[PDB]
Amino acid sequence: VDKKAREYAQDALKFIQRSGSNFLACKNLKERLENNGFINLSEGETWNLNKNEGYVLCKENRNICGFFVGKNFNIDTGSILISIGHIDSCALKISPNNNVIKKKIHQINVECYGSGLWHTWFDRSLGLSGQVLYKKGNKLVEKLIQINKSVLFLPSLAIHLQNVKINYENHIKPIISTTLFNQLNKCNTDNSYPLLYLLSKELNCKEEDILDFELCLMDTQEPCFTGVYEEFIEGARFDNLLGSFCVFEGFIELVNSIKNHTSDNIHNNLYISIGYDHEEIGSLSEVGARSYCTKNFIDRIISSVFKKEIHEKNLSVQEIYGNLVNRSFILNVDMAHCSHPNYPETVQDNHQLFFHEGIAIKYNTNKNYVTSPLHASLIKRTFELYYNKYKQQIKYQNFMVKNDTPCGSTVGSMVAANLSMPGIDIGIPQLAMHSIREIAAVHDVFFLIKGVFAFYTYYNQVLSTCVHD
Amino acid sequence: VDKKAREYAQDALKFIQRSGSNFLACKNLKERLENNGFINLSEGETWNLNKNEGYVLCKENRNICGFFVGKNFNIDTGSILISIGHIDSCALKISPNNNVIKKKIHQINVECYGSGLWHTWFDRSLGLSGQVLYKKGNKLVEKLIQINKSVLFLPSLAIHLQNFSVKINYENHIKPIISTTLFNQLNKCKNTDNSYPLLYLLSKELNCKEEDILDFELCLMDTQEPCFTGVYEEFIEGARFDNLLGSFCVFEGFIELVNSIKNHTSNENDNIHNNLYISIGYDHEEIGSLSEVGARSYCTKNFIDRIISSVFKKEIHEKNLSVQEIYGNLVNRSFILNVDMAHCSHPNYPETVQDNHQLFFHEGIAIKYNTNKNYVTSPLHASLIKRTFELYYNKYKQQIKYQNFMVKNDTPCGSTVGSMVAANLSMPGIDIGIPQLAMHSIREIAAVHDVFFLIKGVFAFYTYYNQVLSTCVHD
Amino acid sequence: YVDKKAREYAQDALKFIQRSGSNFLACKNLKERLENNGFINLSEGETWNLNKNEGYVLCKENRNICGFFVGKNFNIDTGSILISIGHIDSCALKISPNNNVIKKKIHQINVECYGSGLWHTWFDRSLGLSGQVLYKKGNKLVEKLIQINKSVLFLPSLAIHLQNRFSVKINYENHIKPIISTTLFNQLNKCKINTDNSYPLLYLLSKELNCKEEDILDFELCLMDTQEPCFTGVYEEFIEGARFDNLLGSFCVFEGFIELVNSIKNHNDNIHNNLYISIGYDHEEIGSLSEVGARSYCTKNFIDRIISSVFKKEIHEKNLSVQEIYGNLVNRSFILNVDMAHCSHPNYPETVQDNHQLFFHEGIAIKYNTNKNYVTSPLHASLIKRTFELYYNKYKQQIKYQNFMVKNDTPCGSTVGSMVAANLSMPGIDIGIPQLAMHSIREIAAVHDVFFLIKGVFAFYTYYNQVLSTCVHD
Numbered sequence A: 001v002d003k004k005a006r007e008y009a010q011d012a013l014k015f016i017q018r019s020g021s022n023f024l025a026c027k028n029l030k031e032r033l034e035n036n037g038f039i040n041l042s043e044g045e046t047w048n049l050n051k052n053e054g055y056v057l058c059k060e061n062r063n064i065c066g067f068f069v070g071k072n073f074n075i076d077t078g079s080i081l082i083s084i085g086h087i088d089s090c091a092l093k094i095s096p097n098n099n100v101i102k103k104k105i106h107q108i109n110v111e112c113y114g115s116g117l118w119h120t121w122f123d124r125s126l127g128l129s130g131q132v133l134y135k136k137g138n139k140l141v142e143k144l145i146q147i148n149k150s151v152l153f154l155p156s157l158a159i160h161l162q163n164v165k166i167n168y169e170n171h172i173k174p175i176i177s178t179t180l181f182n183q184l185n186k187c188n189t190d191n192s193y194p195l196l197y198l199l200s201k202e203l204n205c206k207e208e209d210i211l212d213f214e215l216c217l218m219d220t221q222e223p224c225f226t227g228v229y230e231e232f233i234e235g236a237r238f239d240n241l242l243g244s245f246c247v248f249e250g251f252i253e254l255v256n257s258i259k260n261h262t263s264d265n266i267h268n269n270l271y272i273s274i275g276y277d278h279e280e281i282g283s284l285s286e287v288g289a290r291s292y293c294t295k296n297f298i299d300r301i302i303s304s305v306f307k308k309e310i311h312e313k314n315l316s317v318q319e320i321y322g323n324l325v326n327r328s329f330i331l332n333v334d335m336a337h338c339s340h341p342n343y344p345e346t347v348q349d350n351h352q353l354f355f356h357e358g359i360a361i362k363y364n365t366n367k368n369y370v371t372s373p374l375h376a377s378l379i380k381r382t383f384e385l386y387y388n389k390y391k392q393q394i395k396y397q398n399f400m401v402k403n404d405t406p407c408g409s410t411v412g413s414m415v416a417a418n419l420s421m422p423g424i425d426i427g428i429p430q431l432a433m434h435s436i437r438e439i440a441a442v443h444d445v446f447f448l449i450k451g452v453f454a455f456y457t458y459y460n461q462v463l464s465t466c467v468h469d
Numbered sequence B: 001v002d003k004k005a006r007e008y009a010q011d012a013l014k015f016i017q018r019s020g021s022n023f024l025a026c027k028n029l030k031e032r033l034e035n036n037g038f039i040n041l042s043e044g045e046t047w048n049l050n051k052n053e054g055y056v057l058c059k060e061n062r063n064i065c066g067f068f069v070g071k072n073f074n075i076d077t078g079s080i081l082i083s084i085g086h087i088d089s090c091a092l093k094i095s096p097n098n099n100v101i102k103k104k105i106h107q108i109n110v111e112c113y114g115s116g117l118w119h120t121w122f123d124r125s126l127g128l129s130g131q132v133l134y135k136k137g138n139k140l141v142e143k144l145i146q147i148n149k150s151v152l153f154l155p156s157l158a159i160h161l162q163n164f165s166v167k168i169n170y171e172n173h174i175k176p177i178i179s180t181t182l183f184n185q186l187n188k189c190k191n192t193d194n195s196y197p198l199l200y201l202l203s204k205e206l207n208c209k210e211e212d213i214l215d216f217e218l219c220l221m222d223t224q225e226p227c228f229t230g231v232y233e234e235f236i237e238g239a240r241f242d243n244l245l246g247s248f249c250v251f252e253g254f255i256e257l258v259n260s261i262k263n264h265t266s267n268e269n270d271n272i273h274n275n276l277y278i279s280i281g282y283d284h285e286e287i288g289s290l291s292e293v294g295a296r297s298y299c300t301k302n303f304i305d306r307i308i309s310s311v312f313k314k315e316i317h318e319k320n321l322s323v324q325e326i327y328g329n330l331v332n333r334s335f336i337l338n339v340d341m342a343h344c345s346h347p348n349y350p351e352t353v354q355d356n357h358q359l360f361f362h363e364g365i366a367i368k369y370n371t372n373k374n375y376v377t378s379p380l381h382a383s384l385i386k387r388t389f390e391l392y393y394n395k396y397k398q399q400i401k402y403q404n405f406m407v408k409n410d411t412p413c414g415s416t417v418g419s420m421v422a423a424n425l426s427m428p429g430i431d432i433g434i435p436q437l438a439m440h441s442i443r444e445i446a447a448v449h450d451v452f453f454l455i456k457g458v459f460a461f462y463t464y465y466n467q468v469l470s471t472c473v474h475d
Numbered sequence C: 001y002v003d004k005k006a007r008e009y010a011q012d013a014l015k016f017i018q019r020s021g022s023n024f025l026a027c028k029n030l031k032e033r034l035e036n037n038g039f040i041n042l043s044e045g046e047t048w049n050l051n052k053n054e055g056y057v058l059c060k061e062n063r064n065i066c067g068f069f070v071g072k073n074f075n076i077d078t079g080s081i082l083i084s085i086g087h088i089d090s091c092a093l094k095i096s097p098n099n100n101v102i103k104k105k106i107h108q109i110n111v112e113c114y115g116s117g118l119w120h121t122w123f124d125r126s127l128g129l130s131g132q133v134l135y136k137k138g139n140k141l142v143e144k145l146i147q148i149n150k151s152v153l154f155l156p157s158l159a160i161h162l163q164n165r166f167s168v169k170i171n172y173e174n175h176i177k178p179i180i181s182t183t184l185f186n187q188l189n190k191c192k193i194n195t196d197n198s199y200p201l202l203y204l205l206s207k208e209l210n211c212k213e214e215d216i217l218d219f220e221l222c223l224m225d226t227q228e229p230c231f232t233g234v235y236e237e238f239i240e241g242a243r244f245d246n247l248l249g250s251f252c253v254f255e256g257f258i259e260l261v262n263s264i265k266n267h268n269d270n271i272h273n274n275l276y277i278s279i280g281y282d283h284e285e286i287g288s289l290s291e292v293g294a295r296s297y298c299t300k301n302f303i304d305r306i307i308s309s310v311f312k313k314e315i316h317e318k319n320l321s322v323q324e325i326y327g328n329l330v331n332r333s334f335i336l337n338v339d340m341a342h343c344s345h346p347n348y349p350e351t352v353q354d355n356h357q358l359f360f361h362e363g364i365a366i367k368y369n370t371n372k373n374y375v376t377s378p379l380h381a382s383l384i385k386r387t388f389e390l391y392y393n394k395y396k397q398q399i400k401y402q403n404f405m406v407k408n409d410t411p412c413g414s415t416v417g418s419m420v421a422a423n424l425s426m427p428g429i430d431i432g433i434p435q436l437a438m439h440s441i442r443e444i445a446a447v448h449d450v451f452f453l454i455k456g457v458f459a460f461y462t463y464y465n466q467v468l469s470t471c472v473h474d
């Protein structure tokens, strides 16, 4: 129990270090699924899907979808079980025209992606992570890169020169080199020359060959364990790469439980794990939670899996989908606010979250969180079922912000509206959310992984124990 | 020069990494001097000094002073050449009563030492550095420790639980987290003024029981090691550059001069032998220098007085001269070269620079001028040091680049020890440094070439000052 | 009985405070207390031919007190200079040189606000006088220290009725102007030279000095509350009075010092090896910048002059230098700065640092500050805490202590500790006792704390050198 907790956190830290951007999160989660026997399914190909098989798809190399069609997945008693995460995080991203030269220093123009605590980005060893596009002969090559060396620095202004409000335009401009070193190394103009020198060396191409790029600035300080008892994990992108890790680990674990049982109710469901892009910016895109992509994927799965059923029983995709929705559920997973010891005015006295105290069941009146009491009562029952078999408890705690105070929104409600499925919003407690370096607790990583697993395994079973009004 | 500058920068980084606090910078500087054949000297022994000998002293293990008495140091033509730096930086230090328990989290009570940019300390992998006192039998053991693992964290409040503009309460919000009550209990199943998770960490590091730790002076320290940055590896980034980068340069400049004297003696088996060379690293600069180990202390004057008393014991008693008469004579040819970091021209804040006195990376030694004497620099004295750089160039064929600095007239700036030491010692002097950005932050940035220029400038000062003085024509 | 002794120290402290209504009278009373314990009065203007195993007392300008005892075996090799400090000035309303004010048929006195006092507390109090008077007697310029314990002056508040009724903003120049008489009574009395002085004031001063009004040349007089300090509380556990800051601390420095001297003069140890110093500086309340303040060269000169006398043979026969002997002794020397501390105020909890709260009867406040407003460093406080432990081992009486610090956001007052540490190149700590209402005409402290402080001073003097020999360096 304690051995497996640290193991998950160690694996979680390795995954976060390798996934410095949304693009690298897709690649890493895709490779993780490929290694568990998942088939690389594309959008621009005919879907000829088989039952008792897993499939993997990265839409635009920035949206991760993993799904497993159950051995005996049926229209009448089956469920579409979706657990969601988001593979994007707040970042400083390089602007299209980034060449800035002020006070003899070469700088990079950067965009402010998401509502980040930008002051934390100041005075940090910065690397790069993203997608680049370069000409190679007659082709347009897309390559995913990550520079783990410190090449950029966003310097603070000395206290001595002041009598703090950051201007996001003028003050957030990181330095890359000096005009002197740029001149010594020398001996389209919209791109910074020291940046193109770095990118050319990385891609093994000419500076001239670099066309366009989508790159995040990334702290080179690897995530690690903190505290005298090494009970804490600290690092960038915990929101929501720590959450997405737990979604995919719990999903992989269920797929392996099905594979393991093959080597009984667990065979009649469609199991989906999805890591969206564009969450930090409001989800409105083809790869974000508001996209038709998810609904289309489900329709395409239904069409392939029930090809004979729709033609023989005269059913439509819409008819099948409506039936499945009655037994379907969405478990949205995103980071939660741990009760801050230095800011007690921010916590609602009765809905306080503590480190190692388990999964945060997130409630919001204005439905910023999809959670409803009945749906949460069902998920708590799957954890009770997990406890009866595994003799291991899944810890939980209810969250809510103060009535007079506003809070952030999750994809839960967007996806629930789009798919017309019930759902709840969960996650694990963390501090400093939207900082370049956040902090979470080791046992909560364990609780979330087993929490997502217990949901996939027991939702359909709990559903049969229900008596309506 | 280009390869040498990178070698200097590498050594500077290693010294800054090994020195997470004033205590450790002073120990590392002492060891460096001993390794160069410097004799250990205690304040509590009779000083029976010799010419052509180097000595090292550590007042209270937080003040560092190195001195070399020239083979021909004399009352009539000699000079006292002093180069200063400071070994303290802005830091979050552990409070006497540090035990804090709020929202099921064990916290440590901390103090804000100096005028640091405290927001930069939030969300960092923090360790410890400094002095610890514990009982081992019937003895009070003083041990200097440095824990380079992440043990402490100052968490920011999330943006979601906030109504851009950053406003920190230094008492309430600067309280790092050490553990949960759960794990503290678990480890307890596997005086009260001190945090138990903290005593556990210290006792393990010292190899004593928890009840043994009496008192400690511990600096929280960024565990992220200083490194090189920029596409061309032309910048250095790390904590304590102010003033462990300047202090490193003072000591390397002083060691280089001593080695040149030792090599000159080995070669000639000339004017370099007639002076007393001193290099001092004070503590408490960040807090106004008022202490027994700070620039306002009587210690410096007392050390000079003791060297004079010893070295000129024959002349005092035979020629019937006093320490004061000898001191007064020497001071006429003496000089203080104060070294502290300067402000590079910030590319994102053009409103902060005085248009004609702008500093740039790799553009040399910053000659710091202030009208209110926040910097001791005077035109004549700057002129003299600028001539030592010319004499260096003539001989070693390497230019020591310089650049004049000043803040805008309507704007205030921080002071240096320069003027304090000049008043105390009755000596002339200047304020020099190297340009850096993000001063008083937990991670500052500087340039590689400047490190090279500073070391070469300190060596040039020590070598040519007395020579330069002999070419002066009075009014 | 420790409790009986605590009450006795407290009773003695109050009598001393009552008689010391100014820096001048604190100095005379502390000097007289030292002379009664067999200390030799020393003048700065005479050749110091000191003897070892003797106590000396000097009063620079009759406003700075210094007591010192030279140990029989005070030596260069193993000797320590142990200094305990207090300050003998307090916040006060002091008579201005041109004090003659006449408004609304009332004779008033022009006063200076000395130190950062809680001036509203000075209103509606029975005021007397304490200080120095200069007068001509034939061919002589006579200095005379006086104290008038009768209520002669009054600083009246303005009636609440004549105001908007509630907050109070005092104009230090306009509203701080005490009344001495009416023009009617001044006219009747003279009917029964220099116009810069209030005539009713010259009349008061001349009756006291037994001279003529025209003979009064100059004076440096503090206005002083005539209400004597006393015990308070249902159980008489508190002491209340003026000038606790820092005549209470200064009393405890000198009593600790007298107890040490008496322990040597018997009226492991290694007690005869040291030079023991007790000093009461003037001017702490205004920054300490004077020849009689803690920024003065006098302390360094006093030590140098002691070194010159006690080590005359080592200097003139063995060819040692004052500076060499000084440098050597500094390594084993220490400063115990004593000044009042802030007790946790029960009505203003927002002013306390939660983990560093001071409480009445709970011991000696060991005061910490990062900006070095207090000279205290964690290693040096540890050495002092150990002297208290050794005291307990011998006398089986505990010296309670409690750590103090202000909130990180909030600023605090400075002490003479860091000034003397830089001046003398010596280590040291800042201690004191908890009180409430610092800078008020009437402050309050606790009886048990008076006991602990006196013992803490004694224990430092007695055990520092012993504690120092038990130290293992890095």
Ligand SMILES: [Zn+2]
Pocket (backbone or CB within 6 Å): A086, A239, A240, A279, A334, A335
């Ligand atoms: Zn999120």
Ligand SMILES: [Zn+2]
Pocket (backbone or CB within 6 Å): A239, A280, A434
């Ligand atoms: Zn977010």
Ligand SMILES: [Zn+2]
Pocket (backbone or CB within 6 Å): B242, B286, B440
């Ligand atoms: Zn500084």
Ligand SMILES: [Zn+2]
Pocket (backbone or CB within 6 Å): B086, B242, B243, B285, B340, B341
């Ligand atoms: Zn500095």
Ligand SMILES: [Zn+2]
Pocket (backbone or CB within 6 Å): C245, C285
């Ligand atoms: Zn005071």
Ligand SMILES: [Zn+2]
Pocket (backbone or CB within 6 Å): C087, C245, C246, C284, C339, C340
């Ligand atoms: Zn005081």
